[PDB]
Structure 1
C-alpha cells in the first residue's frame, strides 16, 4: 500500500500505491486512484492534527502520491483506538458490531511479521525497550487524536469507528505521529446509514472501494477528486 524512499537523515519520501492487501496478505487487488486518495486524505488529517498541537511526521507534498516526511526512530507498535465495536474486538469482548463503547479502548500491537502482530500490554512493551512513560505519552496522544478526528468527522456526517496509528521518536526525543491516516487505516461509517466508507468495503466486498473512498474525500473537501 505504501513505499518509503530515503532522502537523507532528516527526511524521506512516503509514497502511496494503488495496491490493497487484506487478511494477512491472502486477499490482494489494485484500485486505480486509491494511492492518490489515501495520500490526499493523510495530508488533510495531518494538517488538522498539527493545528491542534499534535506532532506528526508530515513535512510536505512532493507531487503525485508522494509525501515528504520526517525520519524517525520508529516504535515497533500499531496503536489502535476504538469508539465503536468492529473488527477484531468482536473476538475479544462479547459485544455486537456497532456497540457504542462507554469510553474509547486503546490497544497496543507489537509489529512483528513472524508473530503475526500480537496484542501486547505495558509489561511486554517494557521488555521491548519502551518505558511506561513512553507508553503513557503514546496513549495520551492517540486519545487526543481520537477526540479531534471524531469531532471533525461527525460534523461531516461520518462516525469514526476505530483507527490505527504508528509513532516514532525524533532527534529531540519527542514522540511523533507517523505512517498514514486514511480509509485504509480507519473505520469510517456514514452517520445516517452506518455503511462502511473504508477498507472494509474491500475486506468484505461491500461495494466499490474507489467509490467509497471518493465519497469520504468529497464529504471532507466539499469537492470531487481530480486525481
Structure 2
C-alpha cells in the first residue's frame, strides 16, 4: 500500500518533470516520460524515460561526495505506485536562484556568446575555438531563469555574487566545477562525454550547500558518444538524435522553422530512443536497468 499522488499537493511543473509537497519538510521529485526537442515538449512519450533518468540521477548522486537533497530510498513507501522508479523523496531546501552550469566543451549558447564576443559568462577565451572545442579547465557558465518558454539568460560571476553573496558564489563556482569534473571523467572512462551540465543548489537549516536537482541526466547534460567525438562539427545527441533526425527529415511533414508544434513520433523512434537511454544508463552505472524499481 502506497499513497496516491493525489494525497500530495502539486507545487511545480517543468517541461518534463513535476514537484509535489509531501509534508512541511519533504517534497516528491517526479520525472515524466515526456521528451523535449527543439524547445517543444513532444506529443509522444518515451517509455521508461522517467525511470531511466531517475536511475541515472541516483547513480550519479552515489558517485559524488557532495551533500544532496535525497531523503529516502528509491522504494520509499511515501512514493506512489504510479510514479515508482521515477520519483524520489527529497528534503525541502531554500533554493538558490542560480542555474549552475559547467561546460567542458564549447557548444550551444556558450559557443554563440564566444562567437559574438570572444567570451562566455565573463570568461575571455583563447582565439581559434569552434563548435565542440574542448575547454580546459571546464567553465563555470551560470544562468538565470527567464520568462516561461524562454531560454535561461547567461550571466557572469559578478551576477552570481549579486544573487547569493560573494562567499556563496565562490562556493557555487568551485562545487559546480568539482562535481562536473568528477562526473565527466567517470562518464568518459565508460565511453560517454558529458559535454556540459546544469543543476540547482539549495541551502539547509544549518546553511550548508546541498545539491538539489536531477543530476547528469541527458536532459540536464549534453550526452555525446566519445567514440565519435570530432571537434569542429555538431555532435550527435546520444539520446535524442533519432528524434531530431526524424522530425527534421522527409517523413515527418514538419518544418522546424515554422515554429508550429511538431507532430507525434513514430513508435519505432520512441522505442529506439528508450534503448539509447538504457544503453547510456547501463554503460555509465555499470548496472542493469532491468533491476531498477518500477510499477
TM > 0.5 between the two? yes
Q: With structure 1 as the length reference, what TM-score do the two structures score? A: 0.87
> Cα distance, 1:200 vs. partner?
5.7
* Structure 2 unaligned spans of 5+: 1-15, 77-83, 116-128, 230-235, 248-268
Once residues 199 and 75 of structure 1 are traced to their aligned partners in structure 2, the CA distance between those partners, rounded to angstroms, is 30
Deviates further, 107-116 or 195-204? 195-204
- Which residue number in structure 1 is paired with residue 145 of structure 2? 111
- Which residue number in structure 2 is paired with residue 121 of structure 1? 156
Residues 212/127 of structure 1: CA separation in 2 closer, same or farther (3 Å cut): same
Give SS of 1:5's match.
strand
Matched, 1:20 2:84: no
Give SS of 1:90's match.
helix
Superposed, 1:61-100 pairs within 5 Å as: 61=74, 62=76, 63-94=84-115, 95-100=129-134
Residues 85/209 of structure 1: CA separation in 2 closer, same or farther (3 Å cut): farther
Once residues 242 and 207 of structure 2 are traced to their aligned partners in structure 1, the CA distance between those partners, rounded to angstroms, is 38
Matched, 1:211 2:275: yes
Once residues 201 and 82 of structure 1 are traced to their aligned partners in structure 2, the CA distance between those partners, rounded to angstroms, is 24
Contact 2:106 2:130 in 1 (8 A): yes
Once residues 134 and 180 of structure 2 are traced to their aligned partners in structure 1, the CA distance between those partners, rounded to angstroms, is 15
Residues 131/158 of structure 1: CA separation in 2 closer, same or farther (3 Å cut): same
Residues 138/23 of structure 1: CA separation in 2 closer, same or farther (3 Å cut): same
Residues 80/203 of structure 1: CA separation in 2 closer, same or farther (3 Å cut): farther
Q: With structure 2 as the length reference, what TM-score do the two structures score? A: 0.68
- Which residue number in structure 2 is paired with residue 166 of structure 1? 200
Superposed, 1:174-193 pairs within 5 Å as: 174-181=208-215, 182-193=217-228
Once residues 155 and 37 of structure 2 are traced to their aligned partners in structure 1, the CA distance between those partners, rounded to angstroms, is 22
Aligned residue among 48, 70, 80 for 1:58: 70
